[PDB]
Design a protein around this motif. Structure first.
Motif, PDB file in Angstrom:
ATOM      1  N   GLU A 181       0.829  -1.194   0.000  1.00 24.12           N
ATOM      2  CA  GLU A 181       0.000   0.000   0.000  1.00 24.12           C
ATOM      3  C   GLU A 181       0.868   1.250   0.000  1.00 24.12           C
ATOM      4  OE1 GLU A 181      -3.724  -0.327  -0.365  1.00 24.12           O
ATOM      5  OE2 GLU A 181      -2.320  -1.789  -1.183  1.00 24.12           O
ATOM      6  N   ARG A 182       2.149   1.058   0.275  1.00 21.92           N
ATOM      7  CA  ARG A 182       3.135   2.110   0.115  1.00 21.92           C
ATOM      8  C   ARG A 182       3.723   2.025  -1.282  1.00 21.92           C
ATOM      9  NH1 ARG A 182       7.426   2.956   5.133  1.00 21.92           N
ATOM     10  NH2 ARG A 182       6.041   4.071   6.580  1.00 21.92           N
ATOM     11  N   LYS A 183       3.171   2.765  -2.223  1.00 20.27           N
ATOM     12  CA  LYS A 183       3.688   2.722  -3.582  1.00 20.27           C
ATOM     13  C   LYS A 183       3.530   4.042  -4.318  1.00 20.27           C
ATOM     14  CE  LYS A 183      -0.488   0.162  -4.954  1.00 20.27           C
ATOM     15  NZ  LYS A 183      -0.955   0.185  -3.546  1.00 20.27           N
ATOM     16  N   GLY A 184       4.307   4.182  -5.381  1.00 17.40           N
ATOM     17  CA  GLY A 184       4.326   5.404  -6.154  1.00 17.40           C
ATOM     18  C   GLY A 184       5.648   5.553  -6.873  1.00 17.40           C
ATOM     19  N   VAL A 185       6.135   6.778  -6.994  1.00 16.37           N
ATOM     20  CA  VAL A 185       7.433   7.009  -7.615  1.00 16.37           C
ATOM     21  C   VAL A 185       8.527   7.088  -6.557  1.00 16.37           C
ATOM     22  CG1 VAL A 185       6.540   8.157  -9.672  1.00 16.37           C
ATOM     23  CG2 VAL A 185       7.092   9.522  -7.650  1.00 16.37           C
ATOM     24  N   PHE A 186       9.686   6.532  -6.869  1.00 18.24           N
ATOM     25  CA  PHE A 186      10.821   6.573  -5.960  1.00 18.24           C
ATOM     26  C   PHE A 186      12.122   6.764  -6.732  1.00 18.24           C
ATOM     27  CE2 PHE A 186      12.218   2.145  -6.706  1.00 18.24           C
ATOM     28  CZ  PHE A 186      11.067   1.590  -7.221  1.00 18.24           C
ATOM     29  N   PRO A 187      13.034   7.585  -6.187  1.00 14.75           N
ATOM     30  CA  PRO A 187      14.320   7.868  -6.819  1.00 14.75           C
ATOM     31  C   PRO A 187      15.251   6.658  -6.822  1.00 14.75           C
ATOM     32  CG  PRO A 187      14.222   8.903  -4.654  1.00 14.75           C
ATOM     33  CD  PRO A 187      12.866   8.311  -4.914  1.00 14.75           C
ATOM     34  N   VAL A 188      15.741   6.319  -8.007  1.00 10.00           N
ATOM     35  CA  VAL A 188      16.574   5.137  -8.198  1.00 10.00           C
ATOM     36  C   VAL A 188      17.959   5.329  -7.580  1.00 10.00           C
ATOM     37  CG1 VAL A 188      17.433   3.481  -9.913  1.00 10.00           C
ATOM     38  CG2 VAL A 188      15.357   4.788 -10.368  1.00 10.00           C
ATOM     39  N   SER A 189      18.404   6.575  -7.516  1.00  7.66           N
ATOM     40  CA  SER A 189      19.704   6.898  -6.945  1.00  7.66           C
ATOM     41  C   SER A 189      19.678   6.813  -5.415  1.00  7.66           C
ATOM     42  CB  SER A 189      20.123   8.295  -7.404  1.00  7.66           C
ATOM     43  OG  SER A 189      19.058   8.939  -8.094  1.00  7.66           O
ATOM     44  N   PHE A 190      18.545   6.389  -4.867  1.00  7.17           N
ATOM     45  CA  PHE A 190      18.394   6.245  -3.422  1.00  7.17           C
ATOM     46  C   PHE A 190      18.243   4.778  -3.028  1.00  7.17           C
ATOM     47  CE2 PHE A 190      17.491  10.463  -1.368  1.00  7.17           C
ATOM     48  CZ  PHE A 190      17.827  11.244  -2.458  1.00  7.17           C
ATOM     49  N   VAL A 191      18.259   3.893  -4.014  1.00  6.34           N
ATOM     50  CA  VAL A 191      18.018   2.476  -3.766  1.00  6.34           C
ATOM     51  C   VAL A 191      19.163   1.614  -4.290  1.00  6.34           C
ATOM     52  CG1 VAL A 191      15.518   2.810  -3.868  1.00  6.34           C
ATOM     53  CG2 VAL A 191      16.747   2.106  -5.924  1.00  6.34           C
ATOM     54  N   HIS A 192      19.320   0.432  -3.705  1.00  8.82           N
ATOM     55  CA  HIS A 192      20.329  -0.515  -4.151  1.00  8.82           C
ATOM     56  C   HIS A 192      19.631  -1.671  -4.848  1.00  8.82           C
ATOM     57  CE1 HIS A 192      24.741  -1.421  -3.143  1.00  8.82           C
ATOM     58  NE2 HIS A 192      24.401  -2.265  -4.094  1.00  8.82           N
ATOM     59  N   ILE A 193      19.730  -1.711  -6.159  1.00 11.57           N
ATOM     60  CA  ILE A 193      18.948  -2.643  -6.960  1.00 11.57           C
ATOM     61  C   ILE A 193      19.504  -4.058  -6.903  1.00 11.57           C
ATOM     62  CG2 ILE A 193      17.967  -3.081  -9.247  1.00 11.57           C
ATOM     63  CD1 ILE A 193      18.372  -0.180  -9.905  1.00 11.57           C
ATOM     64  N   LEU A 194      18.603  -5.002  -6.708  1.00 11.72           N
ATOM     65  CA  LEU A 194      18.927  -6.407  -6.778  1.00 11.72           C
ATOM     66  C   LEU A 194      18.184  -7.018  -7.950  1.00 11.72           C
ATOM     67  CD1 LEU A 194      16.983  -7.229  -3.528  1.00 11.72           C
ATOM     68  CD2 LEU A 194      18.787  -5.519  -3.611  1.00 11.72           C
ATOM     69  N   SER A 195      18.895  -7.736  -8.793  1.00 11.44           N
ATOM     70  CA  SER A 195      18.274  -8.451  -9.890  1.00 11.44           C
ATOM     71  C   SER A 195      17.687  -9.765  -9.376  1.00 11.44           C
ATOM     72  CB  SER A 195      19.306  -8.681 -10.990  1.00 11.44           C
ATOM     73  OG  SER A 195      20.572  -9.000 -10.432  1.00 11.44           O
ATOM     74  N   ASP A 196      17.007  -9.656  -8.242  1.00 11.61           N
ATOM     75  CA  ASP A 196      16.458 -10.797  -7.529  1.00 11.61           C
ATOM     76  C   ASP A 196      15.255 -11.370  -8.263  1.00 11.61           C
ATOM     77  OD1 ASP A 196      16.288 -12.435  -4.949  1.00 11.61           O
ATOM     78  OD2 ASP A 196      14.315 -11.490  -4.960  1.00 11.61           O
TER      79      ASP A 196
END
Length: 61
Positions: free
Chosen positions: A46-61
């Protein structure tokens, strides 16, 4: 549906923006821009929307 691990806190002001802190899991559900993806907090979709990618550590999980 890739996953990202927030490494920086993002205090959203608009309800379109997502509010999260360092350590939140976000499942990428869409893309808007290079620095702006659309997704939801994993474990609380329920927490969703736009988020800055430069603030997250992406996992190709």
């Amino acid at each position: 549906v890739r996953r990202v691990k927030t490494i920086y806190d993002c205090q959203a002001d608009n309800d379109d923006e997502l509010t999260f802190i360092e350590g939140e899991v976000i499942i990428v559900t869409g893309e808007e821009d290079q620095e702006w993806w659309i997704g939801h907090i994993e474990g609380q979709p329920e927490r969703k929307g736009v988020f800055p990618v430069s603030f997250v550590h992406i996992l190709s999980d």
